[PDB]
């Protein structure tokens, strides 16, 4: 009977073909070239295959390249090869929804994986790490843009803020892997990085929104600033109430305890994210999910392990979708060689300054030199916020009908895409490498 590599490959290809055929039979034209579901399925498969292929290649001393690069390249190729792009189209609504769901899953994972005892003893450190680097990188990015790119100050700051938020989708999985091996959980480095990861897109989005309002002279800056404070407050409050709720009611006496708990956390996080977006407070959803998951994990001292295992499986399913869609958002039109050199220079210098500032922001936290270096190099990744708000400035400029503002929006979009491309894979690789070396393993 068949066995070995041939059996595995035949089973996998049959499963892929069968999934597509089932979807086509149920739906019909929607799962044929030019259809939404066909595009989604093809993007999913291509992202998975690219991740695996990139993981396979390891010629030099360094470990294999991350699957993030494979997924991003798969999406990029699907978008920027005309023949494939014509037959692979995904509605914007579906892409946004899938990316939001992936964000919810990863935020739940991060919240469940935090350590309460460690998080208690590093409070100021987390605040500094979440605030300082973003603001300093935004300021220096605006300074660079005003000179290399010629942008005015308002647009320079729009660029800085849209280039100043790290992606939990890149940081959380790697730090969770490290925490699984106990590689740095003696001072709480994984907890510090996972906690601060989710509070960095409320300072970035708020700054970007207020600067955009100033640039287009629309509305008021006071309300735009206060929106961020309100987002923080309502996120914390909703997360607290929901976490204390699910922490108690699903009780040890119920039969399907694990299934009910996982459904509750996942559904509540997804509902929080989507409803917050709907009601005009985007960013309180992530904080609410983080707080709720953290409190629920505190409630289930050790019974949460199965919940996080199921969520990890869900994340393994959803990561290819997220990163393939992020890659598909970018087009070679933005990355044209007219001025791409200066955009790359600005992104590079901004990243260097961000690393330098992150090193300084953790100086007085009691960490050793190696931990400081690891934290500095584990805080660069930038994937999700940049893709979410990358083209908003250009769209607003287009709506207003101006032409110079369109040029500025084009520069902002180019910078965002370059930052994603040259920061997500390098950051993931650097975390994977420097984890075992610089962090003190525990038993």
């Amino acid at each position, epitope marked *: 009977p068949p066995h070995g590599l041939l059996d595995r490959v035949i089973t996998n290809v049959t499963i892929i073909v069968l999934l597509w055929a089932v979807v086509w039979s149920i739906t019909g034209s929607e799962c044929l070239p030019g259809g939404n579901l066909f595009g989604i399925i093809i993007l999913f498969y291509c992202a998975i295959i690219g991740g695996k292929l990139l993981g396979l290649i390891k010629l030099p001393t360094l470990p294999p390249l991350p699957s993030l690069l494979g997924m991003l390249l798969a999406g990029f190729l699907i978008r920027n090869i005309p023949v494939i*792009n014509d037959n692979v189209q995904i509605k914007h609504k579906w892409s946004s929804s899938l990316r939001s769901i992936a964000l919810s899953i990863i935020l739940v994972r991060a919240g469940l994986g935090l350590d309460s005892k460690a998080l208690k003893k590093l409070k100021g450190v987390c605040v500094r790490l979440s605030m300082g680097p973003c603001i300093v990188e935004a300021c220096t990015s605006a300074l660079l843009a005003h000179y290399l790119l010629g942008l005015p100050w308002q647009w320079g700051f729009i660029l800085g803020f849209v280039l100043g938020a790290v992606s939990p989708a890149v940081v959380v999985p790697s730090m969770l892997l490290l925490q699984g091996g106990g590689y740095g959980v003696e001072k709480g480095v994984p907890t510090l990085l996972m906690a601060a990861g989710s509070f960095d897109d409320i300072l970035a989005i708020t700054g970007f929104n207020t600067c955009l309002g100033i640039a287009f002279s629309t509305g008021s800056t006071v309300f735009n600033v206060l929106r961020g404070v309100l987002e923080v407050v309502i996120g914390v409050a909703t997360g607290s109430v929901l976490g204390f709720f699910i922490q108690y009611f699903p009780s040890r006496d119920q039969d399907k305890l694990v299934c009910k708990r996982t459904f509750l956390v996942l559904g509540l996080s997804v509902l929080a994210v989507f409803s917050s977006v709907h009601f005009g407070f985007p960013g309180s959803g992530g904080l609410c999910t983080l707080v709720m998951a953290f409190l629920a994990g505190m409630g289930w001292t050790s019974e949460k392990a199965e919940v996080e295992k199921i969520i990890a499986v869900a994340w393994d399913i959803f990561q290819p979708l997220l990163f393939g869609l992020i890659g598909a958002e970018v087009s070679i*039109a933005s990355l044209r060689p007219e001025t791409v050199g200066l955009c790359v220079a600005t992104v590079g210098i901004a990243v260097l300054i961000r690393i330098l500032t992150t090193f300084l922001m953790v100086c007085f936290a009691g960490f050793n030199l190696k931990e400081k270096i690891f934290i500095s190099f584990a805080w660069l990744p930038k994937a999700t916020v940049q893709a979410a708000i990358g083209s908003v400035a250009l769209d607003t400029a287009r709506s207003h009908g101006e032409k110079q503002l369109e040029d500025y929006g084009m520069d902002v979009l180019t910078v965002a895409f370059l930052s994603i491309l040259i920061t997500a894979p390098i950051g993931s690789l650097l975390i994977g490498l420097l984890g075992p070396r610089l962090l003190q393993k525990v038993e």
Partner: antibody
Amino acid sequence: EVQLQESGPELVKPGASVKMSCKASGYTFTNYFIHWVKQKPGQGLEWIGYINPYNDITKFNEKFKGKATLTSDKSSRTAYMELSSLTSEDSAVYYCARCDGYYRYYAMDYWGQGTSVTVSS
Amino acid sequence: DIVMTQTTSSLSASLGDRVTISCRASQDISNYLNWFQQKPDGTVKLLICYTSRLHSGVPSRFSGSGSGTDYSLTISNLEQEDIATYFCQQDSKHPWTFGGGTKLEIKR
């Protein structure tokens, strides 16, 4: 070689509605903007609006708002314009031109051949 | 409302001289003053984008000088296929406004 083909001349009765198409070949259709220009005889050209054939957002000149309805079909590779409640002053040539929306020095580099529209009874 | 005015609607020109089409805007467009050419048969081709940036494939005889709010397009030498109507367009603001057009009649 990139060219755009529009429908032939059409005659319509006043108060009726007319659809005109613009089929683009020789380039990636969804990668550019489709701009509609109306040239009435004697007068100069008049920018009607444009359609982004990637996510279907249309911008219209205030004069032609309501009178024109822009749509596109990626599969068909064509862009359509709707002219409702025609009038004797709506009789003129209509052009479709592409424009690179993500280029800092964009313009309308390639134009259609024109689509004479005559509104009479 | 950036309505663009071309002073001359029909300028006579010989077959070996330098012609200059002048276009002025009712506002301050920085440099977004694309030039178009329409031949008598009804074909319109882009000539010069962004004031002076000659478009690909256009003969070198066309030079889109001029800046501020008073632009001009020049022909180094006049060829028989140059006889057409020339429009100056501005995309500085939202409503893209074309010029009145200029007709090149051969002097005799």
